[PDB]
Write a protein that binds this DNA or RNA. Structure first.
Ligand SMILES: [Mg+2]
Ligand SMILES: [Mg+2]
Ligand SMILES: [Mg+2]
Ligand SMILES: [Mg+2]
Ligand SMILES: [Mg+2]
Lengths: 209, 55, 119, 114, 123
RNA sequence: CGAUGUCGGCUCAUCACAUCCUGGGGCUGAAGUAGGUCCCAAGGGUAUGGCUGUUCGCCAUUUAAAGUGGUACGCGAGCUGGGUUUAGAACGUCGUGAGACAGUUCGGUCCCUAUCUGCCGUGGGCGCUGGAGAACUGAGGGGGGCUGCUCCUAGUACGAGAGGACCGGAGUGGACGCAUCACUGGUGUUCGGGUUGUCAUGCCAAUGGCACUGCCCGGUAGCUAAAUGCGGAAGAGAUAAGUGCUGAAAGCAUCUAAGCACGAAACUUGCCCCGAGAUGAGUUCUCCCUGACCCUUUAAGGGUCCUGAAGGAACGUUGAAGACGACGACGUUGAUAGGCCGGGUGUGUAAGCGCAGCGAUGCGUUGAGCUAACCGGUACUAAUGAACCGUGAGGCUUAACCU
RNA sequence: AAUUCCUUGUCGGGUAAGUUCCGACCUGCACGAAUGGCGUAAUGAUGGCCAGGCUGUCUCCACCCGAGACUCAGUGAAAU
RNA sequence: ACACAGGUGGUCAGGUAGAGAAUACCAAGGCGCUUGAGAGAACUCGGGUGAAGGAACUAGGCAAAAUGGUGCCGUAACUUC
RNA sequence: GUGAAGAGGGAAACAACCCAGACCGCCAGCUAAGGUCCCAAAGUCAUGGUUAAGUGGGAAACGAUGUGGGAAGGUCGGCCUGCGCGGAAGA
RNA sequence: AGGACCGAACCGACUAAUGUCGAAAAAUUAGCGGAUGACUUGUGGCUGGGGGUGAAAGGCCAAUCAAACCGGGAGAUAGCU
């Protein structure tokens, strides 16, 4: 199937009658407007491009304005593209509500995780810290050995070192759908999704059925 | 912790290539005093956006 | 990670930072305009605008709070007499930052911070 | 962000008495097994209260037969059924965590009047 | 949360008074043991006329923990001390014939039903 | 030997398979269960402790196991310095002695700010053939590919008995990884209170300074785990060991020389991430640029005046983005930041006044006062310009398509 | 044994598990009486072992506060 | 060798609390230590706090943590008393 | 004998192996060892056979034969032989 | 009364961290031992190199000690580099 673009509103919980507190994630999914439908005859692959939200004429540029004018819809935050399966068809300018998730049970959410900046090896790769005492000198959280003697004579690629952590595209798979709503443009997903409050999320049906 | 060969004037020139200054272009003029000043900064005489704000 | 944290520490511990802001608030209320480094100005704003907010109302308790926060009888007197009823028609935002230039000693971004009414 | 506020407002219950920390309370909670539902009482001293709208909770400490049990409760959770206040404590501190090491009749709390 | 080298109290009448968890069972590299978890213990203190003597190596189940339990509604039940009921070494059955102090509802199983019936209070 | 400076341990790994477990098979002195041996298979996993400086080893207790090796017996410009192998001293033995040891004992300085390669991240320049704003395809590359227990099948087949399946399904755990603060918590020297000593604000009251935040008590937001969600797959193609069908050479037989079908955590996909510097520089959508003079080697030439757009950049306010860059939001046609109002939260009944108590204190005003980073509004303050960069339709041959 | 190679000798105690420790045996490689032998109260920044409280020593690290690291202005080394 | 966190003999030495010339805050008196401004990454240094456990770390409780005052009661083996 | 004290061409690279001893210059020809599909100069030359293993392009005891050739015995069983196959696992 | 006890000045230096092209060619910080005595310190004097002195380590004798420093023999000698 296809997915939708939402904004992460935050997290809360839902109490059920049998006394279960289900931690959920509120995802505001407004009606996505389709701007361009690509097919094999002109693009080599079939897919749709959608937009969500609202911008202002002062904030939109001339190429984006022309693209949205040719599409016939109002300008949204950005443009996201969903791969089409075989059989499903969509028209330019079509508004896609959150009724697509009315029958799904598990969804995958994708979004840029929080940015941890320059993180150390202990924070990033869960290295075990060395001794804080017993003579240890200036090596309390250092990575330690990063190779072998002159036989390799180098450091292998993909060696876990300190560096940039977070702030990257992360997908969480097979999240149970708790409650869908169209009049409020909501999507309550059980569990945690990547990103901060107010980040753009991409919610698609779970591939790992 | 020290070099085994000396780097050249070429490597020195490249490392110094990335360390260069940049000339400020945002030089506005005051509508009333007519003197050059940085954007969002008061003039030498105490004017800003055509209003004497500093004695 | 400075995630949604506010306030600049300005290479000072909490005591020195609070004392410097107290002295700078006193000096700003005394002279109605001063020149300081741009981050010092942006933090002095957050320090000294609540003082004028306390000065807008008038009570013994508020005068005592302002004296606790400024430690200057002359400053609290001026703050409750002149600047108090003066900003009665403003909804906050009593100061004005005017970036002057760069200090000759260490090349720091200087700025004149003044009261909006000083005319 | 009023969406989460609206969800919390629609899930919150309007049948919660006003209790202060230090009061002796009794919570009737639902214990389920299969289809049999019983109402179990847990009567102790409120040592902590956290107010977060829907996510509000309270920590109650009862000295059982041999040990001293502490149980936190979500105020708007359906596992609880009723909250009653027997005594009203006259403490002047929000978190009564010193009652853990009081462990005696010096853990008694004076009453207050109205 | 009971790990290796953790002193527990005894909630039964087997004779032991203080035990020390020497090994948490259930898997490799396992580090903690909540309520209703078999642990390998050794007896540090005991009474003279008891069914178990000081220095034995038996199994036991954690019944009270300072860390507490997590009910599905998100409510916790913390205790003032870490208690346990001793078990036989191979039959996993309680050695004592009484239970002292409250226990939790996590023990309603086919192995601990005797304990949770014998306990004076199940909260 | 104009120095390759250590046995072990810690952190960190990486490879091989002569495979410890998981996986697939063959034979059995394989009834089943459990095993013995052999073949294929390196994807992952492959203990915590007591003793000793120990590698090794002995012992205690779990699971699927606590594999064997290589990498300067990996790893000290990464850490320790217990032993060994300095200078002090002592015991036993040896020698008259200085001293020495198939020996033992107590104590005994571990330097280096990274030039180059390498690696982890992140930028600037240019290219990609007019320039620009976006969305992608995917050549290629990287990561998890761990598993126990229980239940149903079923007390079924098997089996003298006792025990007790294969195949298949479901539930629940341990370790590991990813993400997030809704819960439980930790921190929260920027919030509130208590309190000791002292100094000051003239004094009382009330505050402020210092004493590790003076010592404490709680604690907002963020950050975080012990907290909470998710993942390991299913499937498909080609196979290893192995099992075969049909089948001649060789009138039979034969899994093979022709042809066909099964067949593993292994290989290629499938899942997630990076990814057109993929110089092989890809695709799609949209936007903008449609002037006149001269000259010389008839150049893809330069110059003159006018235009210099779409967009970008600089500057300002800034961010759950961040070392700096970079990235994102906003710049009066605005909620970007600060302030203000309302709220929430936290601390917890401010100060002043009155009453009781001659006198510490209590009581009412009062769940008051104060409240950071949170939520919703509000232009009060600060975000001043088409000012700067970027232009005038974009080279030759061919090939189809109109002259 | 500050002395014992065999040797982590053997037995008892301690610990779930003790090459160290404590009390014994003598089979003292290779104790021994002023190069003093054996005890010994008190003392010791002395050596070895055990127990209690205590704790980030660790399980397994988390957050915060200051000083550098980082960026801007000025001055401006070194070994090699 | 330096406008160097070192060394250098003797005299005077007040208030409050304090046994005290320790200590904490002050008086007289003298200083703010001759590079600064921001940022608030890894990592290092000096500190604060910490769920459950409490030496499981390590050669070794190394380091930290902990105890800490006055008055009264009470205080073991051993001993040169 | 060579290197030491000898460069040049070959064996990928490789003092000591093979060919060959540099007085200098030349944009001439012929050869040695080794080679003639391309890297990379020269035969995708000619004739008669073998191998089906990438043997060539790492090896043994032994095992089976998979084929080629020769001489013998009553279509069939033995003998000698050329090229093969398995034995053949490492960072 | 005490080569008595706890603990400042003073003397010393047991542990750890920092520092190791340091602030310092031996220190800083946090702890530490003695602290009426075989104590410590100021001024001056004496002992001179196979010599001094040494509550003894081959320790100290001007940042140097199994034989100080300076000058001379001296361009020692070097089958070594
Ligand atoms: Mg806008
Ligand atoms: Mg050398
Ligand atoms: Mg050593
Ligand atoms: Mg002994
Ligand atoms: Mg600089």
């Amino acid at each position: 199937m296809i997915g939708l673009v939402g904004k992460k509103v935050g997290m809360t919980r839902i109490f059920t009658e049998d006394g279960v507190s289900i931690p959920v994630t509120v995802i505001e999914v407004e009606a996505n407007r389709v701007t361009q439908v690509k097919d094999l005859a002109n693009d080599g692959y079939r897919a749709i491009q959608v937009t969500t939200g609202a911008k202002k004429a002062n904030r939109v540029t001339k190429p984006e304005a022309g693209h949205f004018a040719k599409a016939g819809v109002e300008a949204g935050r950005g443009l996201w593209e969903f791969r089409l399966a075989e059989g499903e068809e969509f028209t330019v300018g079509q508004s896609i509500s959150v009724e697509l998730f009315a029958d799904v049970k598990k969804v995958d959410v994708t979004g840029t995780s929080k940015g941890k900046g320059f993180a150390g090896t202990v924070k990033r790769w869960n290295f075990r810290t060395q001794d804080a005492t017993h003579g240890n000198s200036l090596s309390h959280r250092v990575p330690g050995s990063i190779g072998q003697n002159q036989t390799p004579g180098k450091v292998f690629k993909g060696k876990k070192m300190a560096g940039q952590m977070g702030n990257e595209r992360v997908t969480v798979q097979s999240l149970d759908v708790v409650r869908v709503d169209a009049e409020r443009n909501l999507l309550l997903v059980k569990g945690a999704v990547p990103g901060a409050t107010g980040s753009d999320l991409i919610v698609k049906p779970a591939v790992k059925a | 912790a020290v070099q085994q060969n000396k780097p050249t004037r070429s490597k020195r020139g490249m490392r110094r290539s990335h360390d260069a200054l940049t000339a400020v272009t945002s030089l506005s003029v005051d509508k009333t005093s007519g003197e050059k000043h940085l954007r969002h900064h008061i003039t030498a005489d105490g004017y800003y956006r055509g209003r004497k704000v500093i004695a | 990670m400075r995630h949604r944290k506010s306030g600049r520490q300005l290479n000072r511990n909490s005591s020195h930072r609070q004392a410097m802001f107290r002295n700078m608030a006193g000096s700003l209320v005394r002279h109605e305009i001063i020149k300081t480094t741009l981050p010092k100005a942006k933090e002095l704003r957050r320090v000294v605008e609540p003082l004028i907010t306390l000065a807008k109302t008038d009570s013994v308790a508020n005068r005592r709070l302002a004296f606790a926060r400024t430690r200057d009888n002359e400053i609290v007197a001026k703050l409750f007499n002149e600047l108090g009823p003066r900003f009665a028609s403003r909804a906050g935002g009593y100061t004005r930052i005017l970036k002057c230039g760069f200090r000759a000693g260490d090349n720091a971004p200087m700025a004149y911070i003044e009261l909006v009414d000083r005319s | 962000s009023n969406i989460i506020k609206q969800l919390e407002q629609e899930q919150m219950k309007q049948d919660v008495p006003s209790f202060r920390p230090g009061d002796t309370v009794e919570v009737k909670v639902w214990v389920v097994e299969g289809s049999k539902k019983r109402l179990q009482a847990f009567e102790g001293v409120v040592i902590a209260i956290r107010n977060r709208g829907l996510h509000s909770a309270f920590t109650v400490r009862k000295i059982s037969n041999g040990e001293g049990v502490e149980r936190v409760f979500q105020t708007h959770s359906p596992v609880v059924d009723s909250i009653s206040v027997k005594r009203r404590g006259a403490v002047r501190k929000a978190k009564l965590y010193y009652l853990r090491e009081r462990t005696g009749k010096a853990a008694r709390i004076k009453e207050r009047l109205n | 949360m009971i790990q290796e080298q953790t002193m527990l109290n005894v909630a039964d009448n087997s004779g032991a008074r203080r035990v020390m968890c020497i090994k948490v069972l259930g898997g490799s590299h396992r580090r903690y043991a909540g309520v209703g978890d078999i642990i390998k213990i050794t007896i540090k203190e005991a009474i003279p006329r008891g069914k178990v003597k000081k220095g034995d190596v038996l199994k036991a189940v954690v019944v009270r923990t300072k860390k507490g339990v997590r009910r599905p509604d998100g409510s916790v039940i913390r205790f003032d001390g870490n208690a346990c009921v001793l078990l036989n070494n191979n039959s996993e059955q309680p050695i004592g014939t009484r239970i002292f102090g409250p226990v939790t509802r996590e023990l309603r199983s086919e192995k601990f039903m005797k304990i949770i019936s014998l306990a004076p209070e199940v909260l």
